[PDB]
């Protein structure tokens, strides 16, 4: 009965900010598959992505918000969520 859907993707230019939303009816984020970050509000980030992304979640809406700052064309990838595997949404930077 547990379904995970991703939202908030699209195309963002260099230096922009993007917000990634996963709806849940401990969470982990992946990109493609490379490990990204983890939440429990104790939070953990990979060093390849450290200092750029911030993850928070609210139990009221049962969604996890992943705030990305200063995106670059290097991180053009499809991002998944893991608690079961999420569908994933494509993010491209031009």
């Amino acid at each position: 009965q547990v379904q995970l859907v991703e939202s908030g993707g699209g195309l963002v230019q260099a230096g922009g900010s993007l917000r990634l939303s996963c709806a849940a009816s401990h969470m982990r984020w992946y990109r493609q598959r490379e490990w990204v970050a983890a939440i429990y509000a104790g939070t953990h980030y990979a060093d390849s992505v450290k200092g750029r992304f911030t993850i928070s979640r609210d139990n009221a809406k049962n969604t996890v918000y992943l705030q990305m700052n200063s995106l670059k064309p290097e991180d053009t990838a499809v991002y998944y969520c893991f608690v079961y595997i999420g569908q994933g949404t494509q993010v491209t930077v031009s």
Binding site: H26, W35, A38, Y40, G42, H44, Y45, A46, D47, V83, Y84
Partner: protein, 107 residues
């Protein structure tokens, strides 16, 4: 038995003190409750990575902190076990010599 015992005790002591054999042996029996990073609801990938990272995986993905901590834990346990083993061997040797002297009917 004197020589028969000094022969392998050196091997066990040296191997345990070096600790690499014990690490490669008992790596997979490490606990994961302490570390929140090893949730892994799949409960099968976790065992594989646990048995995998000690050998040659490398692959720095910021989990190497847990790898290093648990490796130090197993190395410390190995060397302490080696000290326990050598102390027990020495105590047993001394007690056995004393028992041999006590139980010997010859003067």
């Amino acid at each position: 038995t004197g020589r028969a015992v000094i022969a392998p005790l050196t091997w066990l002591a040296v191997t345990l003190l070096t600790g690499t054999y014990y690490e490669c042996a008992a790596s997979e029996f490490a606990s994961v409750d302490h570390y929140p990073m090893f949730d892994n609801v799949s409960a099968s990938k976790r065992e594989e990575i646990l048995a995998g990272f000690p050998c040659c995986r490398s692959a720095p993905s910021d989990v190497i902190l847990v790898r290093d901590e648990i490796a130090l834990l197993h190395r410390y346990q190995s060397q302490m076990l080696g000290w326990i083993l050598i102390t027990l061997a020495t105590i047993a040797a001394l007690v056995s010599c004393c028992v041999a002297k006590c139980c010997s009917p010859l003067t």
